[PDB]
Point group: D2
Chain length 377, copies 4
């Protein structure tokens, strides 16, 4: 019934033959048959399906209260699958104006070359979202909170816009995780995750997922999962599943630690602006409160003294690790403007060069606050 329970129990039952309590790691590419096309348990070739991946898919679906789940080699592979399943040449996608850089790069640098068009919009403005919808729009791509500004989109509101124009709605739920936000309950057709981030939780397995309740959509995804073959290995699928068992517990601590870090930085003279969905003054706070169970582990801040101060903070932390990625037990810090591609100018919001992004981990909060205090001098 509860999400912590499902994350542990759903989608692998102890094996009948051995009782093994955990899904085994099936490092087999192929599966013996009886008589010919007499499949055992439906298994025939690992890319097509294998038992470890099935277990992960069932756990993933369960924690989003979805009927169907599909696992991929990365978040980007899941995104690529979703785009290729739902779009064809001549179709259009509405996307966020501050999307995840990787998603933006895949759509702008790859899919435009295959005659897909897009329009970026401020997803917080429902009138703008609707206005960006054309007769060719087949998909609205929602991410909330966004990476790195933590902007908020009203999922139920956007889902209505999609229903009214026969466009599917996909929510990239990576930052919130299943633990904090359930987009299918709010009207989304499909949820995407990079399981590399909070679901795995340990910065040790790259992976993606798509979940849906629409059986025909799940079939379209399966055709590309099999056909194009961006599929996870079984050791990685096991590590993803293992991480997922502690997601609920970890997200609670992440949120608590992040709230403390946001309050500390909000009081600190080196900081001009704190971006955290739980702050009453954060734009979209009331939307976040309505659709999220907690406000997450991500905090971004803008430095009063500019790009140099941002770079200095990133350089001087000793517990926050200066590295890309997010959603790990270990705190991570980065300066996102350093990752700017020239090409995004005009099509995506400029990430301010005074901004630092903090992925607040589950270390003792006093040590995290002390690290930031010393780093800031």
């Amino acid at each position: 019934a509860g999400l912590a329970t499902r994350a542990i129990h759903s989608g692998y039952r102890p094996d009948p033959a051995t009782g093994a309590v955990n899904a085994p790691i099936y490092a087999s590419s192929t599966f013996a048959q009886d008589g010919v096309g007499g499949l055992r348990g439906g298994y025939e070739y690992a890319r097509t399906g294998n038992p470890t991946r099935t277990a992960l898919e069932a756990a993933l679906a369960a924690v989003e209260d979805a009927a169907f789940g599909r696992a991929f080699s990365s978040g980007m592979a899941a995104a690529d699958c979703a785009l290729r399943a739902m779009l064809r040449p001549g179709d259009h996608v509405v996307i966020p104006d501050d999307a995840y850089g990787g998603t933006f790069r895949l759509i702008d640098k790859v899919f435009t070359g295959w005659n897909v068009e897009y329009t970026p919009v401020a997803l917080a403005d429902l009138d703008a979202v609707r206005a960006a919808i054309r007769p060719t729009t087949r998909l609205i791509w929602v991410e909330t909170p966004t990476n790195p500004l933590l902007s908020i989109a009203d999922i139920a509101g956007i889902a209505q816009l999609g229903a009214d124009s026969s466009a599917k709605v996909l929510v990239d739920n990576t930052f919130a995780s299943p633990a904090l936000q359930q987009p299918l309950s709010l009207g989304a057709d499909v949820v995407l995750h990079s399981t590399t981030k909070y679901i795995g939780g340990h910065s040790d397995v790259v992976g993606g997922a798509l979940v849906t309740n629409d059986e025909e959509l799940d079939q379209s995804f399966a055709f590309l999962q099999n056909g194009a073959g961006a599929v996870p290995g079984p050791f990685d699928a096991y590590l993803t599943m293992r991480g997922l068992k502690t997601l609920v517990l970890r997200m609670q601590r992440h949120s608590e630690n992040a709230a403390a870090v946001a309050e500390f930085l909000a009081e600190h003279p080196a900081i001009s602006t704190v971006l955290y969905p739980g702050l009453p003054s954060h734009p979209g706070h009331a939307v976040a409160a309505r659709q999220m169970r907690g406000f997450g582990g991500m905090v971004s801040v803008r430095m009063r003294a500019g790009r140099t101060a941002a770079e200095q903070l990133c350089a001087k932390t000793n517990i926050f690790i200066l590295a890309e990625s997010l959603g790990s037990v270990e705190s991570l810090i980065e300066h996102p403007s350093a990752m700017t591609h020239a090409s995004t100018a005009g099509s995506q919001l400029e990430v301010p060069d005074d901004l630092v992004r903090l992925s607040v981990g589950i270390e003792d909060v006093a040590d995290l606050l002390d690290d930031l205090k010393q780093a800031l001098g």
Copy 2:
């Protein structure tokens, strides 16, 4: 210098810090910075275990560049998307691997890519299939499951003449038996799931090239679409590769013995094996392959039912999909299938493993009756 040596030694050098003789499994998605350490920033983009695997793959094909992927089909998908756009055309085999045909015909046609299937053995027919829009010729040799042979150097010349790239799917032969880049191909593809890994335990793919711009086009899609291998799997793939030369030699010896046994057996009408002088394309095979491989396909005298029953009755050959394993595998391909040749329903495909040959021949003799 020798290929067995390179498989073992090229690519990963024992580590400076520890001397570990094998490439470590870096189960890390991200890398602390100072600039980067070692050039690593985020594992999808690059990581040390995949770098090692890519360097070993490139070394065994005498290629400057290698890219590793989550499967053979992901490597194919990367190749098609890097080299084609809407409005372009690809010449393909008339008896291509079913997964490659399915991807091109069921997915890429929907993105305004066109194709023409051709008997690759007929160079005049290959040339005639080339249009002004043809940007790629897709070569597989020997083909899966009919073991037909394509003249790589002759097709390479056709590509050069019409400014079309030539890709060779070298899965069946492997780098130990065939080196398409030395024959003019622009890119080589492998399903490393098969002979490179060798043990039916890791799904993986690879693209290797000498063309730096083309490797960059591949990298853009490896990173951007993210069909990338995990580090335990890249380790297993590398591990397998260390015995490829030695395994392919025994595969080939065992296959030859199987082909001769089955040639002499009355239950069998036709034997398809590149090493038989009567096999169509044998002379081409002999010129471009160091050995004739581990795969043998046969046609049963008594038809489909005799094919089905042979597959059911072996006790050492395992009835399963896939190929290129230490363990012998057997399948009835027609049960897995105007745009491609019809695989005869009396055909059985044997992936002959490295078991003792006398046990394999005994297993076939009892199963055939």
Copy 3:
């Protein structure tokens, strides 16, 4: 500084060459040298030492505030090492009268055959512990709380007895974990863990550990770690480290869930007695409150209707899994009964309370009890 912080950060620092944030899995049995004996990083042969095991040993030591750590293939292999390092033929060990059955088996069925003698004692009675000490006693083996009765031993008090008689004191800290109890700070010479249980946390890696501040004792352990070779593989050592990263967080929720389960069962008429260190009426509660930061995830109960009711409860739960072992995220349940040691009552059920939603756990027990 804080324990959750050290669990994540002490031990492995991101690699200088690559910055990898996690300790790599070094699946190498050997290491290239620069000239004969020019070692790289000290590494020469995996059984003797390897980078993934080093990383795990540093993490394990850090979380016990210990100078030295050693990792083994299982908890029992750590135990075997400790016994072999600290005893010889003719020596004696004082042991708990309700020790972990594996430990008792190893000592009674193997080490007695090698002319080591033992005396079982109620560790809660310090006079009895002291009286059990002979001139040949070299080791006092403490476990607290015990498996499965959750009896408590005063570590500091036994430490004093060990000091007074030149006997070393080992504490098996598996049930409490480093997150709840720090025996080296109370005077123990050595701490043992089965990392199979809470430290790994996910019922997916078998492993053991010894930690100490005594460099000489660590050397004696190292000699047998290398020489008898009961050493973990690197995938397993990585899984153990990964688990450790969430230990503090998990033990908090284990303790909360367990307290709720104990209260529920204490109120239920099918239950005669509840064994949980956190109950004020539990024998040894005050000692537990002094030496433990929290009361753990284990609960044992005695059934009013006896052995058959204990069997039935174990069979009828759908969230608690009927299986051996303990200290996993997933709740586990078992019927332990199924002159040298206390007899475990055949009406007793042992619950390893996991981290699932507490309302689901209480509902599972309610339905199973009928």
Copy 4:
């Protein structure tokens, strides 16, 4: 029936539920039961037994034509288990005078402290072996060929001496491997392997094994495997099984390559002596030919110019890697007198300081000979 076939097929049968062709990696420490004691497949707790270890144990036993197999965390843990199973205080073991250094160190430095005694003997001299047997001798420890000197022992002859005096006979078959030598067929009671070496074959898993036909001895080993817990992880057990699949093929090439290296070195003026069981002049060559199917991958040589020449050869090779261990696909080289412990003096033969040990791998032979030629100057 043939050994290559058994190595691939014996032990693990493709799974009934899924048909997986390979033994799955069961990363579970525990197994669900049906009602209390209703075990599934006999599994209860992983240290006691687990499906991946079972599969390995079955494969190991099959390749030695043995009824019983037991897998350990290392060769040394297998040795420890054998000694503890078969000896008690007051008992005695006859050992080689030139044993593997690890085996000797365990017996001399650990077991002597537990009141076990030993006598080292030239195993090639059956009279001497017999004379070393006392009323308290419970075990004769045979290693052939020995590490590093490649001396040969007559297994059948020594088995007879053990039968005559009711002492068990153990053969450490690590260097020959099951592909080249089958000691149970020659009368041994137990065979030990470090599977770290040729069976794994890839210098990537540490492991050990004991195999026997005596059910009571296998029970005594199980008691200590379970009780003292020196047991392999499932990943490592899987890698050991994977390596075993190619053992027969590898050992053939190792033997071919080694013979070529021994011939090259025998003709080279910098080399005084070549130690290889296949040379007709090697002491014990006729015994080796009688009991071994091939002469193995190890070659040791003595350098005419002494210790410094031995050190130089080891430092100057670029294909042979200067590292410990042996039995890998990659060639390895070492100077064993640097690895020996001084306190063996008087109880073991001295390994001459002019000796180089070569573990000849499966690289191309021409490259291996070129490497030795350049390194020797």
